[PDB]
Structure 1
Amino acid sequence: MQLTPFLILLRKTLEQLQEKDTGNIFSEPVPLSEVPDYLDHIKKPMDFFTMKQNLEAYRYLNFDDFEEDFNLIVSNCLKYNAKDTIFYRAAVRLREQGGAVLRQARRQAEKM
């Protein structure tokens, strides 16, 4: 646990993104057992737990790779689900609120 300012920032940012997911519907992988066709359409599933595991294994080297995985959580959800669903509407809201979190966090990352 030799921390860096960058990794601390990513940890804080991930917590701020998860706070926007008040129903915790993006906290864990979409359960493939409950949805057997998910991988037929979604090439790379993503969720906040997987992102936390990547972070704790020190696999995010820059802000772009971190943001790319967040964007997968949203875009996977919009792709798989019909527009008139709780999941789709939640992904739209997360894109909006999470985008603001990422804008502020990238500004802090830029001055590192």
Structure 2
Amino acid sequence: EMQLTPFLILLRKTLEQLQEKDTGNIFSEPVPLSEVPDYLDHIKKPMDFFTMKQNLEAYRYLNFDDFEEDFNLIVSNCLKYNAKDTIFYRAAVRLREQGGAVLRQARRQAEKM
């Protein structure tokens, strides 16, 4: 229950804040399946911040939980695919932590709308 335009503005700002936490830009674009031929063997739904931006602009996120679910996929896919002793795995842990804080604040803003 709220106006659509301010909610989308909030999600755009939140998505920018989450991307800023991915300093290596390793989550900015889809995992290149040509370079990782086995990626889809066990990853059911790839996700990345560019796809999230597309989904946002296509009006596919109309509540906070659907936005947060796709962010959580970025994290969970990376934890699943990569071994614990890799930079990629630790980057996903760091994004989970830093992004979680961004998301809690953004949700508190939405609840005032």
SS of equivalent to 2:24: coil
1:25-73 deviations in Å (ceiling 9; x for gaps): 0000000000011111100000000000001111111000000000000
Q: How many residues align?
A: 112
Please, which runs of 5 or more residues in structure 2 have no aligned partner?
Answer: none
TM-score, normalized by length of structure 2? 0.96
- How far the C-alpha of 1:2 sits from its partner, in A, is 11
* 1:65 and 2:66 are equivalent in the alignment: yes
Query: How many Å separate the matches in 1 of 2:82 and 2:60?
Result: 29
Q: Provide the aligned C-alpha RMSD in A.
A: 2.0
Q: 1:55 to 1:77 in 2, by over 3 A?
A: same
Query: How many Å separate the matches in 2 of 1:83 and 1:18?
Result: 22
- How far the C-alpha of 1:3 sits from its partner, in A, is 6.7
Please, which runs of 5 or more residues in structure 1 have no aligned partner?
Answer: none
Q: Identity of aligned pairs, percent? A: 100
Query: How many Å separate the matches in 2 of 1:3 and 1:100?
Result: 23
1:60-89 deviations in Å (ceiling 9; x for gaps): 110000000000000000000000001000
* 1:101 and 2:95 are equivalent in the alignment: no
Match of 2:40 in 1: 39
Query: How many Å separate the matches in 2 of 1:83 and 1:29?
Result: 21
Query: How many Å separate the matches in 2 of 1:103 and 1:63?
Result: 10
Following TM superposition, the consecutive aligned residue runs of length 4 or more in structure 1 with deviations greater than 3 angstroms are none
- How far the C-alpha of 1:103 sits from its partner, in A, is 0.4
Query: How many Å separate the matches in 2 of 1:33 and 1:74?
Result: 21
Query: How many Å separate the matches in 2 of 1:3 and 1:64?
Result: 15
Match of 1:8 in 2: 9
